[PDB]
Amino acid sequence: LVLNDLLICCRQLEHDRATERKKEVEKFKRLIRDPETIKHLDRDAVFRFLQKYIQKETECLRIAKKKMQEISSLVKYFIKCANRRAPRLKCQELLNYIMDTVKDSNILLKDILSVRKYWCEISQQQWLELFSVYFRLYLKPSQDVHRVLVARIIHAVTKGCCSQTDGLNSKFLDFFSKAIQCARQEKSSSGLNHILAALTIFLKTLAVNFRIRVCELGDEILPTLLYIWTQHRLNDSLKEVIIELFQLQIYSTKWRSILYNLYDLLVNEISHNIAVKENLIELMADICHQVFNPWLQIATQLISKLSPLLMILSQLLPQQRHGERTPYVLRCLTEVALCQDQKSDLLKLWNKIWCITFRGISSEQIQAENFGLLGAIIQGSLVEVDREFWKLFTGSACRPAVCCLTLALTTSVKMGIEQNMCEVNRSFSIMKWLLFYQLEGDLENFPHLVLEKILVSLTMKNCKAAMNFFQSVPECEHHQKDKEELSFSEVEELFLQTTFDKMDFLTFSVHQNLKESLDRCLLGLSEQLLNNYSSEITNSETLVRCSRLLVGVLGCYCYMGVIAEEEAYKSELFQKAKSLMQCAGESITASFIKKPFDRGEVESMEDDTNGNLMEVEDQSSMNLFNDYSQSTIGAINPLAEEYLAADIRRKLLMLIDSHLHMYLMLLKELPGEEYPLPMEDVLELLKPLSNVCSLYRRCKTILNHVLHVVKNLGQSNMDSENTRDAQGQFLTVIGAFKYIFSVRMALVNCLKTLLEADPYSKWAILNVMGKDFPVNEVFTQFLADNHHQV
C-alpha cells in the first residue's frame, strides 16, 4: 500500500548513491506506475515522492561519481519524479535544483531541468534569486544556457511572479550582465534579463538611470552584432534616461547625444527598401528623443534622400510630427520637396495629418503646400491609403469642397467611411449623397460605422429627405442578405438603432423606431440560435458581433445613451436565453517566466474558447449593462464560474468586471477562489476591477464588506509580498465604513506607510481621497496624517 513503494524505496535504497546505477529504474519501476511516488505520495509517501526525487538526488551521489549518464539518470529520475509528481515533488525540485544551479560550471545535466522545471517556482519564487546573478555571472562566464541566461529575467520573473522580488539594483545580475555587457555568451537571453535591469530606475533614480545610458553601447551599439538584447535598454534609455532626459528636459547629452549620434549613425544602420523602412519609429522616437530630448534639416535632407534614407526617414515623419508637433518650418520645404517625393505616402499620411495637426507651425507656404502640394494630392485624390489617410490627413485641416461630389463618391472605412465624419465635420447641420450614402449603404457593410449612423444625422440637419429611403434601403440591406447566414449581422446593421437614436434621439429610437429595426432586431435575432444551438466552431462571429453589443449607452448623449437604447433595450431578452444557452453551454468552453506567468495566467491563459461566451460574458457584462428581459437570468447564469477553477477562473475573472447580497455570494464565490488563489499573482488588480463592481455593489453588504474584509487581510495581513495592488484597495477605501479592522474607515497609516514603501512613493496617489471631501477632524486627521506622512 503505502509500503508498496517501500520496495521501490528499497529499490530506492537499492537506488541509493552507488546502487542507483541498478535499482533507480527499479525504484522507478514502481515509480513507473508511481504507486506512492506520484500518486499515493500525495500522502506519508511524499517522502517517497521526496525519495522519488531527494533520494533520486541521493541516487546519483555515488552513481554519477565519469558516470555523467548516471547523473542523466538523476536527470531522468528526478525528471521522472517531476514527471510523475502527483505528489508535491517540489522538495528536491528546490534543493536539488538549487544543487543543480549555477552552484551545482556546466555539466548540462542539471542546467537543463533548472530552467525547464522553474515554471511554478518561476511562478512562485527565484526566493533565492541571486543564483541567476551567479548564473548570469556564469552566463557571462563560459557557462551559457539561454533559458538560464533568460532565466535571470525568469528568475526576475520568479522574483516577480508570485514572489515580488528585487534588490541590489540587480547588480549581482547587472554586473554579471555588465560582465555580459562587453563580451559573454547566451547574450540576448542574458539580455532578456534587461527587464529587471529596465526596472532598476524604480525605487531608485531614473536620473541615476539618466546618465548611466552610456555604458554597454560600446560593446552594444558600436559592437552591434547582437541587436536582440540591445533594444531593451534603448527604451529605458529612451525613458529612464532619455525620457529621464525628457525629464532632464523637464529638469548623461554626453551619454545621450553621443549615443544619439551613435544612433544618428544607426539611423544609417537602417538600409532604407520598405523592408528596411520598419523600425525607424524607434529612431523617430529617438528623433523625438533627440529633438525635444531641432535637428530636422538633416532629416529634411534624410527625408529628401530615395528609400535608403527616406524609407527610413519618410517613414519616421511622425518623429517631430508626433514626439513634437506643430514643429519648425524647415520641412515646409519638404512640405514641397517631399510633397514631390511608400514611407513618403506614409509621410504623406503622416505629414498631411501633421500638417492638419501642426497648429502654429510657421508658413502659409506649408499651407500653400497644403493648399497646392496637398492640393496636388487633393487633386490626385485617389489612393487606398492617401485618399484614406493622407487625403483625410489634410482632410481634417479643412474638416476640399471638390469632394462634395466625392462625398457622393464616398459610397464605396478609412477610405470609404473616414472623411464622411470629416464631411460631417465640414457641416454642422452636395446634399444628394444620401443615396450615395444609401449606396454606401449598398457599399460599406462597414466596421467603421459605430458613430456613422449617429454621424448620419450630423449633416442630415433633420432634413428627412432620405428618411425612409436609406432607411428602407437598410431594411432592404436587411433584405440585401436575408437568410439565417446574414453578413454584417445586425450589429453592423445596428447602426439603424444609431441612426434611430440619431433620428429620434440625437434628432422613439428604441420602441417606436424599432419598426424598421425589427428586421435588424431580427437580423440581430438571425444567427442567434445558429451557433448557440450548434455549439460549434467559429462561433466568434458572435464574439465579433459583440462589438455593437460593445456599443452601449456609455452614459448618455444625443444618440449616445440612446443607441443601445435604440438597440439593446430595443431588442434584449429574445436571444438572451439563446445566448444564455450559449453561456452556460460554452461556460464549459523569458520562458520559465512565461509558464510562471502562464501559472500566473492559470485563469488568464486558461480558456481560449468561449470567446463568444466571453463575448457573451461581455454580453453578460453588457447584460450587466442592460441592468442599467430577465436580468437575473444572467444573475442565474452567474453561479456558473461561481460553481467552480482555471477556465472558470478565466470566466470568474469576468465577474470582477460584471444584488450586493447576491454579490456577497459572488464575494463569497470569489472568497473561496480568493483563498484558492495562492494569490501572489497580481489578480488583486482584477480584485480592484471587482472592487468597482464591489463598490457598484457596495446588511448583506456588511457581510460582503466582511467578505471584503477578508481580502482586507489579504496582503494587509501579509503586510508584505505585494507592493502592487494596494492602491486600488486604498482607492477602494473611498467612503468605506486585524488587517481588516483598524483600516476600516481608516486605511490610512497603511496607506501612509505605503507611501514611503512602494515603488518608492508609488503610493502617494490616494491622499486626495482623505481630503476628497474631508471633515474638520478629518482635516485635523489629514493634518494628523501628515505626521504619518512625516
Backbone angles phi, psi at 626, to 5 degrees: -60, -25
Residues 731 and 737: their CA atoms lie apart, in Å, by 14
How close are the terminal C-alpha atoms of the chain, in Å? 64
Residue 320 is classified by DSSP as I
With contact defined as beta carbons under 8 Å apart, do 551 and 515 qualify?
A: no
> What is the distance between the alpha carbons of residues 713 and 708, in angstroms, rounded to a whole number?
9
Inter-residue contact 16 to 58 (CB < 8 Å): yes
Taking the C-alpha atoms of residue 309 and residue 671, their distance in angstroms, rounded to an integer, is: 59
Q: Residue 502 contacts by C-beta under 8 Å, 6 or more apart in sequence?
A: 453, 454, 455, 456, 457, 460, 509, 558, 559
- Residue 194 and residue 235 in contact, taking contact as beta carbons nearer than 8 Å: no
- Please identify which residue in the block is written with the cell numbers 557557462: 143
Question: 274 is written with which cell numbers?
Answer: 520598405
- Reported as half-sphere exposure (CB side, CA atoms, 13 A), residue 585 has a value of 15
C-alpha span between 745 and 754 (Å, rounded):
16
Residue in the structure block whose three cell numbers are 533559458:
147
Cα–Cα distances in Å, from 339 out to 287, 307, 368, 380, 456? 21, 15, 11, 12, 33
Question: CA nearest 159: which of 591, 789, 596?
Answer: 596
Cα(236)–Cα(210) distance, integer angstroms: 9
Asked if 520 and 499 count as a contact pair (C-beta separation under 8 A), the reply is no
List all residues 6 or more positions away from 786 whose beta carbon is below 8 Å from its beta carbon: none
Burial of 74 (0-12, 13-18, 19+ CB in 10 A): buried
Quickly count helices (H) and strands (E) in the chain.
49, 0
C-alpha to C-alpha distance for 726 and 682, rounded to whole angstroms: 10
SS3 category, 167: coil
Give the span between the Cα atoms of 568 and 510, in whole angstroms.
8
Q: Contact 366/332 with Cβ under 8 angstroms?
A: yes
- In 3-state terms, what secondary structure has residue 153? helix
DSSP state of 745: T
Distance CA 486, CA 497 (A): 18
Cα distance between residue 327 and residue 358, in whole Å: 7
Say what the resolution is, in angstroms: 5.7
Residue 725, all three cell numbers: 495592488
Count of CB atoms situated within 10 Å of the CB of 272 = 20
Reference 321, options 342, 293, 296, 339; nearest CA is 296
Measured from the Cβ of residue 743, the count of other Cβ atoms closer than 10 Å reads 22
Length of the chain: 790
| DSSP conformation letters of 525-569 | HHSHHHHHHHT-S-THHHHHHHHHHT----S--TTHHHHHIIIII
DSSP assigned state of 242? H
Q: Side-chain half-sphere of 34: how many Cα atoms within 13 Å?
A: 24
CB distance 751 to 729 below 8 Å: no
Q: Which residues contact 379 (CB under 8 A, 6 or more apart)?
A: none
Cell numbers describing residue 101:
544551479
Rounded CA separation 111/101 (Å): 7
Structural determination approach:
cryo-EM
Distances (CA, A) of 2 to 8, 39, 86, 359, 624: 11, 10, 14, 80, 52
**Could you tell me if 60 and 37 are in contact, meaning their C-beta atoms sit under 8 angstroms apart?**
no
Side chain identity, residue 105: S
Q: How far apart are CA 552 and CA 556, in angstroms?
A: 9
Shortest CA distance to 159 belongs to which of 618, 666, 680? 680
**Exposed (0-12), middle (13-18) or buried (19+): which is 757, by Cβ within 10 Å?**
middle
User: CB-based contacts of 65: which residues, under 8 Å, 6+ apart?
Assistant: 17
Residue holding cell 495581513? 717
> Within 10 Å of residue 514's Cβ, how many Cβ atoms?
21
Give the helix, strand, coil percentages of the chain, each rounded to 5. Answer: 65, 0, 35
The CA R_g of the chain, rounded to the nearest whole Å, is 32
Q: Read off the DSSP letter of residue 304.
A: -
From the list 151, 235, 251, 142, the residue with the least C-alpha distance to 191 is 151
- Give the C-alpha separation, 225 to 702, whole Å: 62
Task: Give the C-alpha distances (Å, rounded to integers) separating 208 from 155, 191, 366, 409, 762.
Answer: 24, 20, 42, 58, 18
Please name the residues in contact with 702: beta carbons below 8 A apart, sequence gap of 6 or more. none
CA distance 507 to 512: 14
Q: Which residue has cell 486585524? A: 738
Query: Do 47 and 2 touch, CB atoms closer than 8 A?
Result: no
3-state secondary structure 14-70: CCCCCCHHHHHHHHHHHHHCCCCCCCHHHCCCHHHHHHHHHHHHHHHHHHCCCCHHH
* Helix, strand, or coil (residue 279): coil
123 grid coordinates? 511562478
Question: 240: how many CB neighbours lie within 10 A of its CB?
Answer: 27
> Grid coordinates representing 41?
505520495
Q: What is the 3-state secondary structure (H, E, C) of 713-741?
A: HHCCCCCCCCCCCHHHHHHHCCCCCCCCC
